[PDB]
Design a protein around this ligand. Sequence first.
Ligand SMILES: C=C[C@@H]1C[C@]1(NC(=O)[C@@H]1C[C@@H](Oc2nc3cc(OC)ccc3nc2Cl)CN1C(=O)[C@@H](NC(=O)OCCCCC)C(C)(C)C)C(=O)NS(=O)(=O)C1(C)CC1
Ligand SMILES: [Zn+2]
Length: 200
Amino acid sequence: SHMASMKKKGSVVIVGRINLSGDTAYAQQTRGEEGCQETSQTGRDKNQVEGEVQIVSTATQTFLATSINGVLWTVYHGAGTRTIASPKGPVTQMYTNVDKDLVGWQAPQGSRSLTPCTCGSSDLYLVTRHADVIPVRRRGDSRGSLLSPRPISYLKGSSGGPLLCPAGHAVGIFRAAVCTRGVAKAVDFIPVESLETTMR
Ligand SMILES: C=C[C@@H]1C[C@]1(NC(=O)[C@@H]1C[C@@H](Oc2nc3cc(OC)ccc3nc2Cl)CN1C(=O)[C@@H](NC(=O)OCCCCC)C(C)(C)C)C(=O)NS(=O)(=O)C1(C)CC1
Ligand SMILES: [Zn+2]
């Protein structure tokens, strides 16, 4: 009830990226934990951004975010309604859909965007926060099975990452693991078509 001392939630902060530009996928950190904490409070992030898949953090969580069609997309259960830190201060979400577990901000300057897939292909690849590339067979509009199941520990922190087609187009955004006794046999993802509808 004391408004003058009510606190403000910090911004989402880009702290690294999954580098996919060469022949080897690998994670890069671009900001450490203390600098992340400070940037979240100010919302002012002057670091150079590169690539399609960002590693992002709040004070309490770390996950991924993926640029498609000039929008940096991630999951509501990671970002909530938070702004993203940018060189000129905090930037408000331009998309928020809790029913899809989806949020989006204008893509940061220097990022590159994935192209939405139009291949109609069911052989997919999930990219994790550790830069593992996981073959996934599409099993429905929003589900795919891991060819080699992994404990959910392996996937934790990768929500907001992409599922890609063989040509590197974006097919969806990783949302939740389909888990049996702690083993992820399948994944739930936000189809790129759903992003495109949200954009309209
Ligand atoms: C392991 C990595 C997975 C990608 C990941 N995702 C999650 O953990 C999401 C968050 C939440 O699901 C949701 N929460 C929502 C919350 C909302 O408002 C608050 C609005 C909409 C929401 N819609 C969903 Cl679906 C639960 N869950 C699951 O995966 C669960 N499985 C599940 O429920 O399966 C059924 C559903 C489909 C198949 C059944 C698990 C935990 C495995 C038992 C991950 O990495 N997260 S994270 O980066 O570590 C992180 C926590 C730091 C962010
Ligand atoms: Zn494609």
